[PDB]
């Protein structure tokens, strides 16, 4: 009876890990496709499964960070969303913190996404008329060429500027979608998705 | 590209069905064991997975009803919980409605659980000093021997009575746990739990 309960809890932890990988794959795909409502519902499922997990493997921590990163990027223009205990931290700043924490290769794409999030973290505040908040995000992030141009843009209180058209929110999303395609390819062989695909293919 | 998206959505629906059965099994086990916090977290995961489902098979509808039934029974003494659009319906009344809707055998255990929920739906109101609400639940449910004894008990405004000790909340829970053990045995062979158990056993 005691061994039975033990084996059952271990089996629930295995299944929870398989559910986490499948939900991360589904979340990545909804993000890449721009399926906003599927992303919302999948995100809710992923959060609930993660709340039911205890200690994590390095792989599971990376998967959770990817889910959290996409959630913040999706909420990047929702300045009312509070992702950190410190209520001042904006969604793009929270995404930047996770991006710098993930155990992943720092290739050129990594740095380009990093710099696009830094620029857009300021741009989203400016576009909302939140000029003082844009200066506070700048101080928190920056923590010379990009830096000084950004401070000049903030000080000129322009709700829109040329620099933000070149390092745009759409540019940031496309670069992130390139990384999401890699995560999708990497996770498409995980157990639950492989098993479900084999079932669907067998019915053709 | 269009066929790929189609196959992927079908595979997500297969995996969602497997997640629903596993979460129902886990929910049943937490209910049977009295693991309140695991029941809360599993219930949250089950609700989120169900929100991500569209059309249901007869089997999936029965699984959802079992999850909803246990959720209401667990909340049976939480008279502040609103499970129906009609705000007057108490959690035990909502459990009774689902119990009468499930495509299941109406064996002696079915009727005993049914009658225990009817009695306790009144008992929980009386124990809270909600005498008028107890009369309203009685009218909605009842809808001769049990019926007339219950109306007499309600009219005597006793926060506690002998009849409710014989057809007690604990008696109701034990009878329901007997049915949950059957559901557990029936669902223990579902795909995700079988696969996870095979992994755990292979590591011994
Ligand atoms: C130990 O650390 C975490 C554990 C869980 C599991 N519920 C979730 C977490 O974040 C949602 C964690 O922080 C990374
Ligand atoms: C068609 O009917 C239902 C469908 C779903 C799927 N989200 C959930 C349901 O209840 C939670 C339903 O009612 C039984
Ligand atoms: Ca804000
Ligand atoms: Ca109430």
Order of H and E elements of chain A: HHHHHHHHHH
Q: Give Rg of chain A in angstroms.
A: 20 Å
Strand content of chain A: under 5%
Number of helices of chain A: 10
Please name the fourth-level CATH homologous superfamily of chain A: Telomere repeat-binding factor, dimerisation domain
Helix content of chain A: over 70%
CATH class of chain A: Mainly Alpha
Shape of chain A: elongated
Helix and strand content put the structural class of chain A at mainly alpha
PDB class: protein binding
Keywords: Shelterin, Inhibitor
Assembly: dimeric
Entry title: Crystal structure of human TRF1 TRFH domain in complex with compound 53
Give the key terms.
homodimer, binds calcium ion, 204 residues, Serine Threonine Protein Phosphatase 5, Tetratricopeptide repeat, mainly alpha, 74% helix, binds 1-(3,4,5-trimethoxyphenyl)methanamine
Describe this structure as you would to a colleague.
The structure is a homodimer of 204-residue chains. By secondary structure, chain A is an all-alpha fold. Chain A has one domain (2-142, 144-202): Serine Threonine Protein Phosphatase 5, Tetratricopeptide repeat, CATH 1.25.40. Chain A has helices at residues 2-33, 36-51, 58-74, 91-99, 108-127, 131-141, 145-155, 163-166, 169-187, 191-202. The radius of gyration of chain A is 20 Å and the shape is elongated. Chain A starts with a helix and ends with a helix. Chain A binds chain B through residues 5, 7-8, 10-12, 14-15, 18-19, 22, 26, 29, 33, 38, 41-42, 44-45, 47-49, 51-52, 191-193, 195-197, 199-201, and chain B through 5, 7-8, 10-12, 14-15, 18-19, 22, 26, 29, 33, 38, 41-42, 44-45, 47-49, 51-52, 191-193, 195-197, 199-201. The site of one calcium ion has 2 residues of chain B, from loops. It is classed as protein binding. The entry lists the keywords Telomere, Inhibitor, protein binding.
